[PDB]
């Protein structure tokens, strides 16, 4: 398996590390998403704790309006982060 | 962590459009419309 | 420090550029570059058609803004779709299915 293939599998495994803790086994509620972000994506936490901003993130990601973040919605979240990392990668040549 | 607030919120303001794009593509793959790629994970 | 997921996101970015920067627009994948990325980095995901017509159909459907290139966002739409296939495999198993 290539690094990219392994990376896609990490996306899947990490989701399920949290999604099965509460309620729907295959979706992230707000608490589960918060844990995932805090523990697995701490490099993306805001400078200050900010519950309002976190609520807005949850709302933004819940595209199908079911009060949960499913796997597809989570892939869109990760893509959005990757797109920012990509802007940094491309945007600052020496 | 970041030096600012709200960057994740900013980056996800158009999540709906991206979900609709992913849904479209996933459906094409699943239905076998793009057989250069598999429709399901396989060994 | 970096989590496996943080590292995985970096691999998404680095892999794209390994190929996008070979020719022409250094920040988008042309047909040749996409084909190399798929064949070399996603070989487990290649289907039963390998001909150029099938590849062109894929390119056309990834290139949603019809500029004859696959940009980073278009590439993420594709990777998300692949990850979803893996997730559907994952979720088919019983909850306490053994793993390492
Ligand atoms: Ca859950
Ligand atoms: Ca949802
Ligand atoms: Ca290129
Ligand atoms: Ca394009």
Residue numbers in the entry:
A (entry chain A): 2 to 95
B (entry chain Q): 1893 to 1935
C (entry chain B): 1 to 100
Task: Provide the authors' original text about this structure.
S100A4 (also known as mts1, metastasin, calvasculin, p9Ka) has been strongly associated with increased metastasis properties in several animal models. The interaction of S100A4 to different binding partners (for example p53, annexin A2, CD16, non-muscle myosin II) is mediated by Ca2+-induced conformational changes. Recently a series of X-ray and a NMR structure of S100A4 complexed with a NMIIA fragment revealed detailed information about the binding sequence and the molecular interactions between S100A4 and the NMIIA fragment.
The long C-terminal random coil region is characteristic to the S100A4 and S100A10 proteins, the closely related S100A1, S100A6 and S100B proteins have shorter C-terminus. It has a hydrophobic stem (Phe-89, 90 and 93, Pro-94) and a tip populated by bulky basic residues (Lys-96, 100 and 101, Arg-99). This cleft is occupied by the NMIIA peptide in the S100A4:NMIIA complex and the hydrophobic stems interact with one other in the crystal forming an elaborate hydrophobic knot between two dimers. Since the ITC measurements did not reveal the true affinity of MPT to S100A4, we also performed fluorescence polarization measurements. These showed that WT and Δ13 S100A4 have similar affinity to fluorescein labelled MPT with subnanomolar Kd of 0.12±0.06 nM (SEM) and 0.28±0.11 nM (SEM), respectively. Nevertheless the dynamic Ca2+-activated elongated random-coil at C-terminus of S100A4 may be important for interacting with native NMIIA filaments.
